[PDB]
Design an enzyme around this catalytic site. Structure first.
Site, PDB file in Angstrom:
ATOM      1  CB  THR J   1      42.711  34.266-104.497  1.00  0.00           C
ATOM      2  OG1 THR J   1      41.894  33.200-104.301  1.00  0.00           O
ATOM      3  CG2 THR J   1      41.863  35.459-104.277  1.00  0.00           C
ATOM      4  CB  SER J   2      44.042  38.374-108.081  1.00  0.00           C
ATOM      5  OG  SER J   2      44.706  37.417-108.883  1.00  0.00           O
ATOM      6  CB  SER J 129      48.366  33.022-105.938  1.00  0.00           C
ATOM      7  OG  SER J 129      47.133  32.947-106.626  1.00  0.00           O
ATOM      8  N   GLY J 130      47.754  35.979-107.054  1.00  0.00           N
ATOM      9  CA  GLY J 130      47.842  36.910-108.179  1.00  0.00           C
ATOM     10  C   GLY J 130      48.322  38.309-107.832  1.00  0.00           C
TER      11      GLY J 130
END
Ligand SMILES: [Mg+2]
Ligand SMILES: [Mg+2]
Ligand SMILES: [Mg+2]
Ligand SMILES: [Mg+2]
Lengths: 204, 212, 195, 222, 125, 196, 233, 222, 195, 196
Positions: J1-2, J129-130
């Site tokens: 995800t971001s 994570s992004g």
């Protein structure tokens, strides 16, 4: 299975006034089982004395090795090796086995025959020289020996007084260690006489 | 530790050493390894010092409560079983105990029970318990007869601990002797190995392995 | 393997060695001789890892016999024991060490004295009046500490040895099927058949 | 994984005389190779002429002392202000320690005081409550250095009467408080020389029938 | 849980529920115990308003608690079974821990203790 | 480490922070991670200090021996020597190296060599633990054929952000300018770059 | 059993003649990511105590709430809540120390190192440490984390024992603290330039300084350092 | 260990403590951590004691042969290169952490070497377990353009920080000053701030205290 | 613990159980009776984990004795074996299972037949003409497969049992110090003193 | 995800990609990571899909029961309920949640709650994570009191870069606008955002 504490044993050396003393216990065991009460840990090559604690097979091997090396030294040099020189030889020999070491705690003691100076030294299992004015300790009761020596010792003791101090250092240290004791030997070393005494100690 | 107890013509001999260790460190040379539960009951200690000390003095309290409730001294069998049932409840938790419950009663006569921390309970005439048990057995078995005199039995028990004290690195200090008769237990002194070894060596002629 | 004992008396060295060879839950043999004669007046008993024991024993035997033929002379028990110790001391730092413990009983003809050496797989050598390897020592040493005298006869030594075997047969967990007993003295090596 | 134990170093020492007892301990407190405090006392007056030290993991040490101090308080409440004798204190501390048998207080405990006959008393405990009365005991990091010296100088071990062929032992005798404090000070300076976790200062608590007195001495700070 | 204090003191200092329990005993069939020089004999009355009984299977009036001790009673029959069961269990428990059968005094002391407990416990008669 | 190299009109510029760590302790706050393997062929070092130094030393030796025999080596050749060492010893190395040089024929060139020992020729490269935080920024802001002043600002702003977020990065921003004119060393201190 | 996620680094402190000083930077680290920059790790309790906390920040915020509640609870049915029965630094510490040791004993610790700095009602300086293990100790200077290794040696040069405390002024003490904070910014990889500092004086009371910056730094010598051995340019 | 190096006007100075440990035990209270590689190139060593001594001797030996071969005074960068390549080859297994300093025809130099073989350059450096205490002092008091006497003061102060605050360090301060155009001056035990106090008691025993079983003369002659 | 055997013949069940109690390298006892009488005509032998064995045996004994007193009646060997199996089947999924293996020899007085049940610690019950627990079975089963007949007398069963003990004494690694032999028949349980 | 949430003049906007993975397989390419816990209090979800859903469901229940008794809850209150669940169950949760809401008194507010369960009130927040790849970009480009169109562009450009570098992120860019005017849902497809 810690190689330095399978057999047990201790060695201690002290300096006095124009003299040196080196002492050791007589025990050789296999962990809990006492096997031999005659296993001396002090050897000499000429006037240079070497005590070795740790794994007994390596004690024997190193004695045989340093007898070998000092014999060839004497043949080529045409003189007895001195304590300072022998100390260096011990260090070189141990570091040669840096990544597969002899599991030992050697102690050099003697009087330089040229200068008359008392000399003692200690080593770790891989050759680090530990020089001292006062005392060197080694073995499974080294903590105890450190405590005994650090309190009992005073400089410039006479040979007969130094004998009492080093003996009481060893005996009381040995009795607080399960793997040390079973008899004791003390060497009093003067410029040209050496006296060897067996001590009466508790046999448990 | 080394401890032992046996039965003979004249009761029970009980002998123990007095050394405590933490690894190779000799912690004590003067530990009391026999506990006097009542005038007719004894308990020996081997293994964990706290485990033995704590639970065997607890056992003494349970024995006292029995004689208050039942108006009669507890049997050696019932006393030993209180301890064994207690440690069985803790089985797997990590208690470390090798004990011997020794005593005399009218209905039983002289009796010895072996009780350990994995729940083993055994009646028997001879037992040796501790890290030096084998050394004690060697001397005790090879000199034991039922018809030993009180004097000889006391010496053999003393000599067997000495044997183990000498050979086992984790045994030593001194020997504590006890004799159990129909009239109860009798203490036969604390005997330092420091003096006892040399005295035995000289008088008996044994221990020739040692530099005289 | 398992039980090997040794007693040095006034005029001889006596070696007792268990007869059992056990593998798993089966006693495969009850008459195994765990000893090799290295020279006319030198005997070596052995115990330890399967295969390793006999391989080491026979290797030492071959070397001493080779020496004997080369020099037309018998090595002293002390000399043989030192050779054996060094071989084990080499071995312990090899890729695969010999896991063998030995007792060497010999009669020194130059000194007219019996000699008993105890050497473990690490190469730990000691001269002793009596010796044992493995769990045997835990019973026999204390027993011998009590009953042994340095001036005993060969017969007294055998009775002293009977006392050890009896104790081991009473308190040891495993059935070792008795012992083969051999005597080393001035006249060489002989086997006691009725023990 | 979270490790609930730590090692705060330091060392302690208890000696008993004929009509007195001392309980000494260095004032250095450490974790790993750092000094937390040069003066953090770990020998305490617990009331009823009992001094106590629990050396090892200081959090456990403080917890135990706190619980025993509280035990003395309630002993008075429940038994008509009766004085807690040193032997009764010892037995009580065993139960405090053994109560955590399966999650032990990581400490060597020593208490000192006078017995019911007025004679000096020292009791020592292992981490799970095994206890024993002695003339002499060192505990903590440098116990292995100090204890053998105490065997030799307090109980005269391995010391024979000169000229008696090692046949007559040096006879046991009580030491004066002056002699005892000399041994304590020499014991700790020797320990300070050869043990990195011992130093900074030395605090001694002396117990007589008159109460509890304190003495402080500097130790090497390196 | 039912908590009511059923056995309580009255102004005159009597516990009526205990005393009324004695009346139930007084209603029960007569039981007698006589001990000789080398024996004890337990005798029990059985009322004869019950003909057509099967005496093979009908609960006997004297019960073995262990192989060496017996128990007879007077009063409520159903109640006695609870006491007999508890006694028999304690008999085996005693043999298990003490490695010796109960004394008659001990077994009696246990049974009496159970009875007492039911005189100052809440929710029980 | 946060490191980068950027090609521009007149050649190429290398950039680096000056932080060397062991855990969270800063063993050196004034490190020089921009290393000369030839007159106008340099590299940015990231990963193990010992590994990258040992590699750079070997490469410098190889290019010195190359020059003795065949004259000036190409930037590609220098990158190939780095690759050869990093690829063949991949099991025993922790080295992320950016190689940057100036030819007169080829102008500015940048090659990045990650952990595995692969080679990647790019207009610009970023590497080190701090690079993660400026992938977004650098991709959005990089243009080809920038001027010297623009490229200096791009690297300064980029490493400023990398330093701001990465604990492993910090100290000064060092830069080395590689053009036909020669070799220029630039340094930028916290008081300037922190408040960008 | 835990593992710390968002963390705060060193908390440093010392005693001076009239009171105590305590400082901690404003960073909330997330591993190697320097994630949060507005984090206040010094929390005042009343006007006589400041609690400085390092370690897990979620646990710090929990401890904040506990101290906040302690103030509320102490005021209940207490007419002297702002006088004789106000919260003392020693009360606040013992409470936290009890909690910390209880939590370690339940194998679920508050992953923190805590320094409680204040002045008692009788004017005495209070400075004591407690951590996730429940370990407590007191010293003229106290510091957590890297501060223990780098700040303590510097602060001990000013106050090396008890007798040095009366000889140390607030100016000298603050100077030493501020210098130690700079050294930590040079050498700790999880430190920030921005920090808070608090002084609790027995005369002037609590002075809370926010948004302080490390300054007067030496970086110029970096220009002269080239290569790692043999490199000249 | 604590070890430091500090550059000044016309040269460089290095210093070290003198404590040697085995776990928590002080093995050597006055060991020499300053090593001579060549007359005017000296090394301060932390880490495994036998390693720092052996690697310093080997490179020192090879440096001497190199000096004789080239008819030139040895350079610090040569000792640096030889040490780092040797240490790198052994992948950290030779635990030598060194501060290499000296003067040569090229000038005055100061470097550090890690066990894995990485090297640093600086005007001030510190290594060992007490390096954080030392570096704290260096970062506080260092400046550009130090004099000889200022640099010695700074260096020994940095070592003292380690002696007092690090349990790994103790006893004395050794110093070596390498100035351009002059002989290097090794200052063994430059500071001795940890002298043992007088003992309270003499533990000299009455002659005959120790029980003896046997006596014999040992032959040391041929 | 270790060796427990059982043989069911025409009119009786014979149980043989080793006398040794070994802990570590010491035989602590050589006269241990590894059996409990559950009822006049039901005997249970046991082997397994130290402590667990006797604790389980005596617990079962108490329960059967309790039943006997309650009903004034002796449970059949089949009924007792089923009760024992269920207790072990419960145990195996407890926090700490009983590690005890048992043989139950009984004479059913209603059927006038001997019965032998083998039950392991998991609660695995089987009725057998002959049974063994542990390593003993690896020698005795094949031996009994050859020499056993279903119509043998008690004397023949004892000779058949002697043959088993002899084989175990020859091939087993450990010294189990002989066996205590007990016979279960119409007249109850008795012990053979000379074996 | 971001994921991210950004406050601006008229309120606050939440943004997210639409990728859910198990290893490198995209289990859902059209996920909705922007979740309603109240009319004008929403959250961005990152970490475990199961954990964040279960938490959001419990929070929505709590705020519904809050509203029944005490009227509209504050954004701070919503963040506190999220925190309470995340903090007390930290051993058994993998949830990184950004809480964003609109009050009329407090206007737009953003609270981020990382793994440990700490709370942090910020002008804007990024997570998932992004997020690592846009710390540089977002810090450089965020301004306070932006307009709606500026804030939409900021989130669009930011998530575009996060998606470009993070393999775990992708699909569409969803956005939710929280103002006094109401609630607006925006969606942006690859063909638009990829070529930014
Ligand atoms: Mg012993
Ligand atoms: Mg220090
Ligand atoms: Mg989950
Ligand atoms: Mg993507």
């Amino acid at each position: 299975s810690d190689p330095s504490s399978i057999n047990g044993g201790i060695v201690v050396a002290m300096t006095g006034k124009d003299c040196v003393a080196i002492a050791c216990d007589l025990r050789l065991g296999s962990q809990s089982l006492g096997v031999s009460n005659k296993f001396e840990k002090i050897f000499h090559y000429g006037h240079v004395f070497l005590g070795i604690t740790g794994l007994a097979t390596d004690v024997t091997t190193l004695n045989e090795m340093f007898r070998y090396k000092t014999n060839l030294y004497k043949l080529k040099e045409e003189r007895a090796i001195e304590p300072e020189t022998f100390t260096q030889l011990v260090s070189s020999s141990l570091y040669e086995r840096r990544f597969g070491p002899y599991f030992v705690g050697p102690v050099v003691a003697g009087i330089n025959s040229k200068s008359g100076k008392p000399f003692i030294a200690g080593f770790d299992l891989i050759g680090c020289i530990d020089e001292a004015k006062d005392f060197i300790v080694s073995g499974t009761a080294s903590d105890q020996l450190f405590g005994m020596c650090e309190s009992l010792y005073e400089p410039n003791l006479e040979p007969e007084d130094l004998f009492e101090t080093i003996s009481q250092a060893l005996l009381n240290a040995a009795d607080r260690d399960a793997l040390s004791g079973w008899g004791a030997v003390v060497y009093i070393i003067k410029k040209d006489e050496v006296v060897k005494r067996y001590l009466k100690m508790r046999q448990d | 530790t080394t401890t032992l107890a046996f039965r003979f013509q004249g009761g029970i001999i009980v002998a123990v050493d007095s050394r405590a260790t933490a690894g190779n460190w000799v912690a004590s040379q003067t530990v009391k390894k026999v506990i006097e539960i009542n005038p007719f009951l004894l308990g020996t200690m081997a293994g964990g010092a706290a485990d033995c000390q704590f639970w065997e003095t607890w056992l003494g309290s349970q024995c006292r409560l029995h004689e208050l409730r039942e108006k009669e001294r507890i049997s050696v069998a019932a006393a030993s079983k209180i301890l064994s049932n207690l440690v069985y409840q803790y089985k797997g938790a990590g208690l470390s105990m090798g004990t011997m419950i020794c005593g005399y009663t009218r209905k039983e006569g002289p009796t010895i029970y072996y009780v350990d921390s994995d729940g083993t309970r055994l009646k028997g005439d001879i037992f040796c318990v501790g890290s030096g048990q084998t050394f004690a057995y060697g001397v005790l078995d090879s000199n034991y007869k039922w018809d030993l005199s009180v004097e000889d039995a006391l010496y053999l028990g003393k000599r067997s601990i000495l044997a183990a004290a000498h050979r086992d690195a984790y045994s030593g200090g001194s020997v504590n002797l006890y004799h159990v008769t129909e009239d109860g237990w009798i203490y036969h002194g604390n005997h330092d190995v420091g003096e006892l070894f040399w005295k035995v060596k000289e008088e008996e002629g044994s221990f020739n392995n040692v530099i005289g | 393997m398992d039980i090997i004992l040794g007693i040095r008396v006034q005029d001889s060295v006596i070696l007792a060695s268990s007869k059992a060879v056990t593998r798993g839950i089966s006693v495969l043999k009850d008459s195994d001789d765990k000893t090799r004669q290295l020279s006319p007046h030198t005997l070596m008993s052995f115990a330890g890892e399967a295969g390793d024991t006999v391989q080491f024993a026979e290797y030492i035997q071959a070397n001493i016999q080779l020496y004997s033929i080369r020099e037309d002379y018998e090595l002293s028990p002390q000399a043989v024991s030192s050779f054996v110790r060094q071989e084990l001391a080499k071995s312990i730092r090899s890729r695969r060490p010999y896991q063998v413990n030995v007792l060497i009983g010999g009669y020194d003809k130059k000194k007219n004295k019996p000699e008993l050496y105890q050497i473990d797989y690490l190469g730990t050598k000691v001269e002793l009046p009596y010796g044992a390897h493995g769990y045997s020592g835990f019973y026999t040493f204390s027993l011998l500490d009590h009953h042994y005298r340095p001036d005993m006869t060969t017969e007294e030594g055998l009775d002293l040895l009977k006392l050890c075997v009896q104790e081991l047969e009473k308190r040891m967990p495993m059935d070792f099927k008795g012992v083969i007993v051999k005597i080393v003295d001035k006249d060489g090596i002989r086997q006691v058949d009725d023990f | 994984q979270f490790n609930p134990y730590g090692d705060n170093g330091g060392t302690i020492l208890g000696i008993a005389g004929e009509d007195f007892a001392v309980l000494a301990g260095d004032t250095r407190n450490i974790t790993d190779y750092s000094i937390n405090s040069r003066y953090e006392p770990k020998v305490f007056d617990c009331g009823d002429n009992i001094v106590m030290s629990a050396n090892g993991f200081a959090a456990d040490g403080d917890a135990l002392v706190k619980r025993f101090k509280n035990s003395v308080k309630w002993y008075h409440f429940d038994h008509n202000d009766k004085k807690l004798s040193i032997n009764s204190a010892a037995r009580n501390i065993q139960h405090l320690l053994y109560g955590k048998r399966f999650f032990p207080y990581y400490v060597h405990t020593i208490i000192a005081g006078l017995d019911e006959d007025g004679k000096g008393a020292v009791y020592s405990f292992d981490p799970v409550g095994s206890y024993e009365r002695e003339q002499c005991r060192a505990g903590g990091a440098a116990a292995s250095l100090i204890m053998p010296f105490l065997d030799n100088q307090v109980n005269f071990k391995n010391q024979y009467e000169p000229g008696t062929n090692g046949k007559v032992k040096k006879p046991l005798k009580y030491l004066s408080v002056e002699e005892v404090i000399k041994l304590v000070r020499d014991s700790f300076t020797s320990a300070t020389e050869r043990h990195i976790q011992v130093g900074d200062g030395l605090e001694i608590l002396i117990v007589t029938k008159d109460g509890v007195r304190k003495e402080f001495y500097e130790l090497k700070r390196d | 849980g039912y908590d009511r204090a059923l056995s309580i003191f009255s102004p005159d200092g009597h516990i009526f529920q205990v005393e009324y329990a004695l009346e139930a005993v007084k209603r029960g069939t007569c039981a007698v115990g006589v001990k000789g020089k080398n024996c004890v004999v337990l005798g029990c009355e059985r009322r004869s308003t019950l003909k057509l009984q099967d005496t093979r299977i009908t609960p006997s009036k004297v019960s073995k608690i262990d192989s060496h001790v017996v128990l007879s009673f007077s009063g409520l029959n159903a109640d006695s079974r609870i006491l007999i069961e508890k006694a028999r269990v304690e008999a085996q428990s005693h043999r298990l821990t003490l490695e010796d059968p109960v004394t008659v005094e001990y077994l009696t002391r246990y049974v009496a203790g159970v009875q007492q407990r039911y005189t100052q416990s809440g929710g029980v008669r | 480490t946060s490191i980068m190299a950027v090609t521009f009109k007149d050649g190429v510029i290398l950039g680096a922070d000056s932080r060397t760590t062991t855990g969270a302790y800063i063993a050196n706050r004034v490190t020089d991670k921009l290393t000369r393997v030839h007159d106008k062929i340099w590299c940015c070092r990231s990963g193990s200090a010992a590994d990258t130094q040992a590699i750079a030393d070997i490469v410098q030796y190889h290019l010195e021996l190359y020059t003795s025999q065949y004259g000036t080596p190409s930037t590609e050749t220098a990158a190939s020597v780095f690759k050869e060492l990093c690829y063949e010893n991949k099991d025993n190395l922790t080295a992320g190296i950016i190689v940057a040089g100036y030819d007169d024929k080829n102008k500015g060139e940048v090659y990045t060599i990650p952990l595995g020992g692969s080679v990647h020729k790019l207009p610009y490269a970023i590497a080190g633990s701090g690079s993660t935080f400026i992938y977004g920024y650098c991709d959005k802001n990089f243009r080809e054929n920038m001027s010297k002043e623009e490229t200096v600002d791009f690297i300064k702003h980029s490493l400023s952000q990398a330093i701001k977020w990465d604990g492993s990065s910090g100290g000064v921003i060092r830069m080395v300018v590689l053009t036909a004119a020669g070799v220029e060393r630039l340094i930028f201190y916290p008081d300037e770059y922190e408040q960008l | 059993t835990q593992q710390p996620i968002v963390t705060g680094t060193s908390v440093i402190s010392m005693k001076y003649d009239n009171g105590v000083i305590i400082a901690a930077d404003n960073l909330g680290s997330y591993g190697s990511l320097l994630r949060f920059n507005g984090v206040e790790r010094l929390i005042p309790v009343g006007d006589n105590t400041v609690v400085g906390i390092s370690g897990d920040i979620s646990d710090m915020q929990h401890i904040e709430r506990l101290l906040k509640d302690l103030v509320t609870e102490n005021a209940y049915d207490n007419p002297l809540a702002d006088a004789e029965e106000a919260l003392e630094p020693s009360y606040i510490f013992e409470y936290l120390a009890t909690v910390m040791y209880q939590r370690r004993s339940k194998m679920n610790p508050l992953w923190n190192a805590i320094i409680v700095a204040g002045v008692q009602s009788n004017g005495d300086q209070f400075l004591r440490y407690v951590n996730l293990l429940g370990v407590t100790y007191s010293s003229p200077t106290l510091a957590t984390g890297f501060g223990a290794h780098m700040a303590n040696p510097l602060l001990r040069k000013v106050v090396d024992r008890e007798s040095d405390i009366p000889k140390t002024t607030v100016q000298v003490a603050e100077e030493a603290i501020v210098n130690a904070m700079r050294v930590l910014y040079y050498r700790d990889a999880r430190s920030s330039r921005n920090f808070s500092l608090a002084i609790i004086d027995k005369n002037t009371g609590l002075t809370f300084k926010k948004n302080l910056q490390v300054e007067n730094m030496k970086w110029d010598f970096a220009k002269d350092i080239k290569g790692y051995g043999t490199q000249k340019i | 260990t604590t070890i430091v190096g500090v550059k000044f006007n016309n040269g460089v100075v290095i210093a070290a403590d003198t404590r040697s440990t085995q776990g928590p035990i002080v093995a050597d209270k006055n060991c020499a951590k300053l090593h001579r590689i060549s007359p005017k190139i000296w090394c301060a060593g932390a880490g495994t004691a036998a390693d720092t001594e052996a690697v310093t001797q080997l490179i020192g030996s090879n440096i001497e042969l190199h000096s004789l071969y080239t008819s030139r005074e040895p350079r610090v960068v040569s000792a640096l290169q030889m040490l780092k390549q040797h240490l790198f080859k052994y992948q950290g297994h030779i635990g030598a952490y060194l501060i290499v300093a000296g003067v040569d025809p090229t000038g005055s130099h100061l470097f550090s070497i890690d066990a894995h073989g990485s090297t640093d350059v600086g005007y001030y450096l510190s290594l060992g377990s007490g390096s954080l205490a030392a570096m704290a002092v260096l970062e506080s008091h260092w400046k550009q353009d130090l004099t000889k006497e200022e640099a010695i003061k700074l260096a020994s102060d940095a070592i003292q920080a380690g002696i007092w605050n690090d349990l790994g360090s103790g006893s004395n301060v050794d110093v070596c000053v390498m100035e351009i155009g002059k002989d290097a001056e090794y200052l063994r035990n430059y500071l001795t701030p940890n002298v043992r106090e007088e003992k309270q008691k003499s533990y000299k025993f009455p002659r005959g205290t120790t029980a003896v079983l046997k006596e014999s003369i040992v032959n040391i002659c041929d």
